[PDB]
Write a protein that binds this ligand. Sequence first.
Ligand SMILES: *[C@@H]1O[C@H](CO)[C@@H](O[C@@H]2O[C@H](CO)[C@@H](O)[C@H](O)[C@H]2NC(C)=O)[C@H](O)[C@H]1NC(C)=O
Ligand SMILES: OC[C@H]1O[C@H](O[C@H]2[C@H](O)[C@@H](O)[C@@H](O)O[C@@H]2CO)[C@H](O)[C@@H](O)[C@@H]1O
Length: 246
Amino acid sequence: DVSFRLSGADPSSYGMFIKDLRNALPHTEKVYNIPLLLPSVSGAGRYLLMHLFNYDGNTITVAVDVTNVYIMGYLALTTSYFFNEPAADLASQYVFRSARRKITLPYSGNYERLQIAAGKPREKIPIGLPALDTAISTLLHYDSTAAAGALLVLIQTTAEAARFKYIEQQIQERAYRDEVPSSATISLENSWSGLSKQIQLAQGNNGVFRTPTVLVDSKGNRVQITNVTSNVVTSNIQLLLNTKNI
Ligand SMILES: *[C@@H]1O[C@H](CO)[C@@H](O[C@@H]2O[C@H](CO)[C@@H](O)[C@H](O)[C@H]2NC(C)=O)[C@H](O)[C@H]1NC(C)=O
Ligand SMILES: OC[C@H]1O[C@H](O[C@H]2[C@H](O)[C@@H](O)[C@@H](O)O[C@@H]2CO)[C@H](O)[C@@H](O)[C@@H]1O
């Protein structure tokens, strides 16, 4: 398991959490020095439990699929909650079985579906450590509309930060003040699967992407990523989605 406590949290402690999260994901291979997530894992070992505590010390446990860093569901007190999707229903066979009741959320874990449930796109939802505190608090008691926004915050401040050093740094900058994600942040989230695939295809193509990936940079300028010498590959991305899952 991995844990993170919002009480006393600072950029350093958050960074240790994201480091713990990355280190909890198994891999047998690195591709261009980036850990390659496994094609699959059988049984309960597929799921990592993240223990998150809000500033008041209240907690939720979030189940994460270690092959793709997808959040499946979470436990709040004696109630478990899962996305309305086959992969999450499968997870519910392994985690939080001792919950007194299980609620299936009225949406899948998809960014488009969550944004629809929340009533707003990611572009408009502030993220940061305070936002994460709020998200944990929101999830403690069922409210599906509020939860959709909370989950948009949670996915970005945990999974996405684990996947991209730039996102981790963006959250550290928001340790004491929330701010909506940069367009670069949204671009990277949207491109993780694409990037993971192209980095793997580069292996037998002399480091060259079979298909360029279009990204928005820090200055808000759209760039083409064509090979593994790009900063996005050498510094930023931290985990690769296995092509067997793409
Ligand atoms: C590999 O990717 C790098 C980008 O990081 C490409 O280099 C850039 O391309 C042009 C000049 O060729 C310039 O606009 C950029 O300033 C370059 N940046 C750097 C860091 O050199 C490079 O062209 C790509 N190589 C291949 C084989 O396509
Ligand atoms: O967990 C956040 C993650 O959600 C998305 O993945 C979904 C996917 O759409 C479903 O097919 C299934 O695998 O469940 C996942 C949700 O748990 C995206 O990958 C992305 O929006 C985001 O990182």
